[PDB]
Amino acid sequence: ITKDMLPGPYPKTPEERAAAAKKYNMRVEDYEPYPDDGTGYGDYPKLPDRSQQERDPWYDWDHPDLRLNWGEPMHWDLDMYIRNRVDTSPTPVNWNLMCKHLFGFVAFMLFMFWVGETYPAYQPVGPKQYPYNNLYLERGGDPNKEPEPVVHYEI
Amino acid sequence: SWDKDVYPEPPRRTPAPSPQTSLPNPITYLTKAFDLLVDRPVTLVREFIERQHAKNKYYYYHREFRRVPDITECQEKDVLCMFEAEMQWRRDYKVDQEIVNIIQERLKACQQREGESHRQNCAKELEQFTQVVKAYQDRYHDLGAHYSARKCLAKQKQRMLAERKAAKEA
Amino acid sequence: MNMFSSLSLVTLLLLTMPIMMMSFNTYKPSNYPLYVKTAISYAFITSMIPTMMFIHSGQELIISNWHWLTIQTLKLSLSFKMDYFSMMFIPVALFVTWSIMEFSMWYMYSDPNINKFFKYLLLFLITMLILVTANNLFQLFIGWEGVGIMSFLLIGWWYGRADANTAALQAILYNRIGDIGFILAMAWFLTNLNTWDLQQIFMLNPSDSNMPLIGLALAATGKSAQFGLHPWLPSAMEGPTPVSALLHSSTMVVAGIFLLIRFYPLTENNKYIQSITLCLGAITTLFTAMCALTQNDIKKIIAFSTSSQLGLMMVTIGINQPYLAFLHICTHAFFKAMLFMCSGSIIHSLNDEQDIRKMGGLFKAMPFTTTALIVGSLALTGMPFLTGFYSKDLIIEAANTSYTNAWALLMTLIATSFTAIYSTRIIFFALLGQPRFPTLVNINENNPLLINSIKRLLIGSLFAGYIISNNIPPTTIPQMTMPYYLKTTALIVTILGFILALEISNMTKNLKYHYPSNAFKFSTLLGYFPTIMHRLAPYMNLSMSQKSASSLLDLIWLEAILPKTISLAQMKASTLVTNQKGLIKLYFLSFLITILISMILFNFHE
Amino acid sequence: SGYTPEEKLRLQQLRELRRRWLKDQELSPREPVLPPNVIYKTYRHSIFAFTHVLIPVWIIHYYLKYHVTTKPYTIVEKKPRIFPGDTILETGEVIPPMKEFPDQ
Amino acid sequence: YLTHQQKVLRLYKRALRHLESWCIHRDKYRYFACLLRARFDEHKNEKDMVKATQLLREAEEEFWHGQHPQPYIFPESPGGTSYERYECYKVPEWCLDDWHPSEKAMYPDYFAKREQWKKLRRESWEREVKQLQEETPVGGPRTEALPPARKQGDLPPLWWHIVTRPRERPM
Amino acid sequence: MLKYIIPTIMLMPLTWLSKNNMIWVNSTAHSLLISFTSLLLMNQFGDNSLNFSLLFFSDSLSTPLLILTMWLLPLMLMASQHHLSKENLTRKKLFITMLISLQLFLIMTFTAMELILFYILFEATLVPTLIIITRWGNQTERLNAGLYFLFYTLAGSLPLLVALIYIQNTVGSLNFLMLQYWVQPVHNSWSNVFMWLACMMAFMVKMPLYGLHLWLPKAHVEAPIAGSMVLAAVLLKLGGYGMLRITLILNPMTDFMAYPFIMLSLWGMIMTSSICLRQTDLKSLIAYSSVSHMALVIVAILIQTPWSYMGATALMIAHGLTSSMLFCLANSNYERIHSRTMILARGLQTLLPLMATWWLLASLTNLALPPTINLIGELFVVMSTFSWSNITIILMGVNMVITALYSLYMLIMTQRGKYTYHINNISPSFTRENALMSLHILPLLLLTLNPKIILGPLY
């Protein structure tokens, strides 16, 4: 690899754009660099922000696991778009609708748990009764002191 | 083997077998098989090993450290005295760590031994643990990684000053 | 004592022996899988002896054999708790693993790395036993992370498949998030109680236990796949079926529940933690059962079933019935392991087909798998006096008569009806009707390893719950007085679930074409939680990692503000100094300025 | 839609080669050339129990009896439950029975 | 890049597979598979291409609305439960060259035959390259198609990695 | 220490007077013997350190660092002898001489009694290290890596020299045993703030602290394998060892001066862990992993608790073996495919089964699987930072999640999936490479059986 075949600065003139496209093995009509802010993209092509999962799995790829061909320009975020990471595939339900139903379901359940906490179910019974002043000694009470007696009567 | 005063154990009360079934107890026979197949051969091997040990009796000793003047008696910057006082303080620090460890072991043994009645029946051990942890915290807590006798003494004097102040105004 | 402790340790040591022999000392790869299977069966026998002594007299003990490390006042020792929970779980776990490994000698026969598979299964078992018998939190964490890493290696068994690797890492990710709660509890207990030992934690019995218990709850959320950290469990169906059987029955998933049971002396005094666990379990049991209603992959249906049953155990924790939660762990291990092996039997017969839409007509072709599948389905739905009835029905009765969140109670009961619906879904589509599988028929379930392994778990799924309930000592006061409609609620809502499920299933045979509702898509796609979270969270995190942390800061601004600016200034200064004309006149003129300034401005002459 | 004549010919030629290659993966009779009832089911189970249960339990029991249990609090047992009407083996003490119950 | 006919036939196959996922039962699927074929048949002879494209455009929108959110996938197809399952067992043939001589000695006959395949590959390479040179336009190849062998005794150019590729079930 | 310094020096005549074909055999055999004798430094006492003479002393902190240092020299020789095969004889002996000289400077650095003696040997390590990087690195960027490495170090180290000389004038001694007794508290003033910074910044750069770490990913990506091993395993720990000693004389000012550096470290460890998830160079990923691990050590040293100092010591030793092992693993791939790009060669488990096992074990130690000493060290720091402030558990817990993701991402990318079709030169793992990996992992795991020897003086 020679320096002329390595990424360079943002292309300013149409001849540079035609030269950059050639270096990246692209049509000059398909080649578009990242916007020339000060972020450091240079002339590296901006390719569609699509996961490698979206590529045709029946094509005879040079790298079948990545679904990449040798010599094709790699997406800047290729390592984020491998099939083990971010998928951008179309979904049967619209993204916005999907968020409404998931959030709505969660919000409803959280509300109803507050309601059920404010209005608990219980049985029509009085408290459980324990002997020996509510088991004062067994629960660890100080032997040397004296609890106020807890008395339970028959009914 | 170990001092029972240091590591106390209440007297053990085992109930006697009082069966109310006509079926044989599978554990009893298994217990007998274990003593025959496992305990007896193991005891013979150990008894042979103890015979060899009895032929070659030799002794080791618990090192005894004489007391030396502590940091309070050391003149400022006198490294020769500070060094011996500092080494003694470091040894005592290690010993106090193990004293707390003994008390915690007593507390943990009591909790397991007393079962479901442990809350009422381990009050004495929980008290002793509470008091020793308080004393250990007073001596050694908050000194930092670069602790020393000098810093420990500074901590104590601050505590004595606060206790004097509270006592006086009271 | 000496027999009890010796045999309890020999059980654990026996399980490590096939691992140590892999050091080639006495090694015969001819039948390592049989060697490992035999070791499990012997360990099961030796573990029953101390179990019998506990049932007889209640004998329990703690073995702190080896002193590992003292950190000032924190003495760390290898310690084993041989109590109620370990003496009952170990034989159940070993009995189930015995069947699973025998099933695997058939299911994985043609795998070239079958020896490594059995080594990994055994390591999975060992780490769980470390978890279950651990007496201190550090020893527990060893087993806690051990099972997690063993799941990673077994979920990703077929490592050439990207989806298998993705699922394996997903299990690690969700479980590490829960582990944050585990280390929070360890830090809190060390700071506040000066211990990681259970004895000291329970003796000191802190009243202000909200922080440590929330930590333990978060750890249980990840490990037991409760709502919020739940998706990884259905994703773990990437692993070979024997992994799913062992993962869902007697190892990983129940560890989260088991952790909360081990700390019941704290949770039973904290009503705030009870409320949180109750609600977390209720949404889990309802949500995952709902997802199971529309799944078509047989392993995924059973996976969502496990999450739903795990949610039920979390409910049982919430209503302060830890011993009933433990019993459900034991009963559930039998019929849930059987269900996976039955699905493995079908999957193998249909050449790795796992979609129930391509099954059917197997009721007579696979009579023994059919019988095991029906028994397991009935045990799961709580048919009276099968193994599942002896925990599930007590749990429902206890929840009905408890002072509890009313909404959580309804969610639990509805999820019980859904359990009957998705169980019917498997039976209807897999066994009944006409075959929907390919024309070359290769159905065959006549291998003795398959039959015997399923047979042992079938016997357990009938009698294990009855035998266990009649031997364990009472530790609570069961609530046996209640109105008839609270006593029979579990059976009634289960029956209605069966009736409603049958009508739904038989309607699929009508010559009418229906369009999917939003509820159908919500259930099918798992409430969209994986679709949104598994895309948005990785994307945002991975975008930040490159755009900001790596590029913006490391490659740009941290370079610019120090080395790049310092170098620039020096270079500019150098050019100023050295860009001289070489003229005598100019140099001597600057001498005149220097001398003048030296006196007028700085008074060097004074 | 159908193979062009040139595509048909290439597939036919590759097909011949592939089938010859697969046929060449078959092992010959001598390969690999390796360098140089009820009772027998009791034996394996007998030797296995000896080397995997008896020997390990001999080692553990010796280890526990003569090293672990010779140190304080290494093996701690919950004390046995004592019910009314029991006899203590150590002392011979007899625990009194509970009071007389009311009828129920 | 797909013609109109290719798009219409791909939609038909895709719609039948999702239809079968909904129906499940074979008799029910047969009924609706015939009704669906009738809809495609109702416009088979449409000649105004603008009209036909609109029909195809609308049919794809109808398919998207009515697709199964979890369609049946053949186990070994992309996205199936056995997809890529055996890739970890596929080992390239060149690995055999690195076997120790004592490992090769275990299969004398296999490795004699392998040596003949490598001889065939070596003797054929230069002719393969030459054929590709003289059959490729000046600018370069415009498609990925490869030619067959022309002369007798020649092998189809670039055959080795297709012929000697791993078996689908290599163990 | 003469029983170690002198035999280390003798390795130089040994290498130069060896037969031409026995330079690797002789130097490797005898450096292993020196490592064996290093275990005699384990004679440590509960109260006093092992004080040999007026120049050298060894305590529980420097002992494990010494044994790691002397263990690494033979491993480095084994790792280097393959890529140096075509080098001419005299230039091989020079390379080995630089490695021996680095070991000589390091063992004297970790045992120097006097802080100025420590400074000089602390600084002498730059010369052989810089020479190794710039003379025997493969790429053009090694010259720039040498400069960044050199001037980042000297930018902080020259102020340290002024501070140390100032301290000796004020106190009268820089002997560390003397300073333990004559230390005085540091009062709040702008003079002491800059005294504090001069005393700490040189060590922060070497750790490296987040924000002063840019030199490190350069130095690794350019250094030869032996340079990477000693850089990661030992040279980073000069900074940690430096702070552990010098913080004695900076109290109580460290109470608040630590805040900016704890923040940089607590946030830095998450930033550098996240960075690892998007690295394309395998050597650069391992380098960024070191920055994240050393962030814990900086936090541990700065909060100054017995638990944090024990965790810091265990972490430094554990990271030394793990990180050096990872560089050796990455280098073994590099010797076949001659590229550091992580995604280039995949599915290597299919082609190199046993090597994939070393990859798994190095990954599990990197993510601190219990009870590895990696986990012991990290856990002790987590326990102590929670007491410092409960909220740190959020940051420490998040970093544990990210560490698992990138540790296993590296494992999955290179070992699993499908192999690259056109990479057909993946020859079987050599005995030398397998022995190199085992000599990392085996001692690392054996230390789990007796962790106290790597927990430092606070044990």
Ligand SMILES: CCCCCCCCCCCCO[C@@H]1O[C@H](CO)[C@@H](O[C@H]2O[C@H](CO)[C@@H](O)[C@H](O)[C@H]2O)[C@H](O)[C@H]1O
């Ligand atoms: C036993 C189970 C107990 C828990 C049951 C929980 C049920 C609670 C469900 C809450 C979710 C409702 O979420 C709601 O769904 C409807 C249906 O599309 C959406 O409705 C909206 O979107 C659709 C489709 O785009 C359009 O017709 C229109 O824009 C509008 O109707 C709402 O924008 C959304 O807020």
Ligand SMILES: CCCCCCCCCCCCO[C@@H]1O[C@H](CO)[C@@H](O[C@H]2O[C@H](CO)[C@@H](O)[C@H](O)[C@H]2O)[C@H](O)[C@H]1O
């Ligand atoms: C924070 C305390 C330590 C701060 C130390 C800062 C002092 C400078 C350290 C690095 C000095 C290296 O010396 C010099 O640095 C610059 C960049 O910095 C390098 O130059 C590099 O950046 C410049 C500008 O982007 C490019 O023109 C050049 O192609 C590239 O190599 C020189 O090739 C190197 O010779």
Ligand SMILES: CCCCCCCCCCCCO[C@@H]1O[C@H](CO)[C@@H](O[C@H]2O[C@H](CO)[C@@H](O)[C@H](O)[C@H]2O)[C@H](O)[C@H]1O
């Ligand atoms: C904390 C105090 C530390 C003080 C340390 C002082 C270190 C001084 C290092 C040498 C300074 C000069 O080093 C010099 O820097 C400049 C830019 O930075 C480099 O110059 C390079 O980058 C600049 C900037 O794009 C270009 O204009 C130039 O064409 C290119 O050659 C030189 O190649 C390098 O030789």
Ligand SMILES: CCCCCCCCCCCCO[C@@H]1O[C@H](CO)[C@@H](O[C@H]2O[C@H](CO)[C@@H](O)[C@H](O)[C@H]2O)[C@H](O)[C@H]1O
């Ligand atoms: C009065 C003070 C004088 C002090 C002098 C003390 C040392 C005197 C050494 C004299 C012998 C030198 O030996 C001379 O150099 C080297 C080293 O041995 C030998 O040749 C060398 O070849 C290679 C290295 O290249 C090695 O195998 C080995 O070092 C040696 O065999 C020469 O064949 C010999 O002629």
Ligand SMILES: CCCCCCCCCCCCO[C@@H]1O[C@H](CO)[C@@H](O[C@H]2O[C@H](CO)[C@@H](O)[C@H](O)[C@H]2O)[C@H](O)[C@H]1O
């Ligand atoms: C981890 C293994 C390391 C392997 C190291 C290999 C090198 C070994 C170096 C051996 C050095 C032995 O050095 C010598 O040993 C003898 C024992 O015979 C000691 O002999 C002395 O020991 C003690 C000294 O208090 C007394 O009992 C008595 O004065 C005498 O026996 C000498 O004090 C010591 O000078």
Ligand SMILES: CCCCCCCCCCCCO[C@@H]1O[C@H](CO)[C@@H](O[C@H]2O[C@H](CO)[C@@H](O)[C@H](O)[C@H]2O)[C@H](O)[C@H]1O
């Ligand atoms: C990564 C970058 C790290 C940067 C860290 C910055 C830390 C800043 C520390 C601030 C404390 C400095 O030290 C502080 O200075 C002030 C002066 O302003 C001193 O003030 C001193 O002189 C003033 C006169 O104005 C007196 O009123 C005061 O009595 C006296 O203490 C204090 O004695 C000292 O407390």
